């Protein structure tokens, strides 16, 4: 059976239970490999391998975690595409339509008490705010270390912790700033001040299915089944699924059955 691989966070299972049911709806067997821990660092080479057959990645983490390539080139599709066939055998099938890119967050007060709008602004009160991220977000090029060289932050703290308690660190209060995701659920949740990355560093994250072409060799009816999403979940529409799952308290598994019935799939 071809195996589905996600991230280690809600939008991630959204998407995976999307695939798996699709692929499933066409008699296609599936095993889930949910919540791989550290996300794309331990993805990408069972994917490689044959270990994971498919997952969903972002254009601009591919753009720098894997194809090496340096930030100031903006992230160019087809290119990822064309370095992914030769040098790793794997397929972008598509973009799904929404682009989840990385922000920062503070609280609303302390925006308002510090005249904070942009992440320079972070930056210079940085003092007197605790920083806190995932794991990889101290390890990425495209995260912190480039957060770094751009802004020269000087965060009185950093916290390094499991993806999933992010938001959580934040609402016991021992970070009081943390890097967020644009779709996150929680920034509504928390009313949350996200800033405006006024130097434009974060380049673009667009969703996308990447499946071994091993598996669409021997599964064509998986692409064209896997192709019927391409451009069927702007921001908007990833957004509310997340908000179904994290504030609905709906399970991944009946957002996504939902979601395919309302896209007729
Ligand atoms: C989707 N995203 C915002 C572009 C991040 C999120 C993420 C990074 N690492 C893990 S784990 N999750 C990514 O996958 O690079």
């Given at each position: ?27 296609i ?24 057959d ?15 390539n ?18 790793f ?60 060289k ?34 996150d ?63 609905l ?11 395919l019935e309302?896209?007729?799939?």
């Open positions: 059976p071809l195996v589905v691989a996600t991230k280690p966070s809600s939008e991630q299972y959204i998407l995976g239970e999307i695939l798996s049911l699709l692929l499933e709806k066409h008699h067997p599936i095993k889930r490999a949910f919540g791989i821990g550290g996300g794309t660092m331990n993805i990408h080479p069972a994917l490689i391998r044959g270990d994971f498919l997952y969903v990645e972002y254009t601009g983490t591919a753009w720098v975690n894997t194809l090496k340096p930030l100031t080139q903006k992230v160019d599709f087809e290119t990822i595409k064309k370095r992914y066939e030769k040098e055998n794997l397929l972008w099938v598509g973009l799904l339509g929404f682009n989840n890119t990385y922000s920062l967050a503070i609280s609303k007060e302390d925006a308002q008490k510090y005249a904070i709008e942009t992440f320079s602004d972070l930056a210079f009160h940085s003092p007197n705010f605790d920083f806190g991220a995932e794991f990889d977000f101290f390890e990425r090029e495209d995260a912190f270390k480039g957060l770094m751009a802004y020269r932050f000087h965060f009185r703290s950093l916290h390094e912790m499991d993806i999933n308690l992010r938001y959580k660190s934040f609402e016991s209060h021992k970070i009081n700033a943390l890097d967020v995701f644009t779709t659920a929680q920034i509504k949740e928390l009313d949350l001040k996200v800033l405006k990355d006024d130097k434009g560093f974060f380049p673009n994250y667009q969703a996308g299915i990447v499946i071994r072409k091993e598996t669409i060799k021997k599964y064509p009816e998986a692409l064209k089944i896997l192709e019927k999403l391409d451009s069927k979940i702007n921001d908007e529409t990833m957004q509310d699924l997340n908000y179904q799952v994290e504030v308290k709906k399970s991944p598994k009946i957002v996504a059955k939902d979601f309302r896209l007729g799939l």
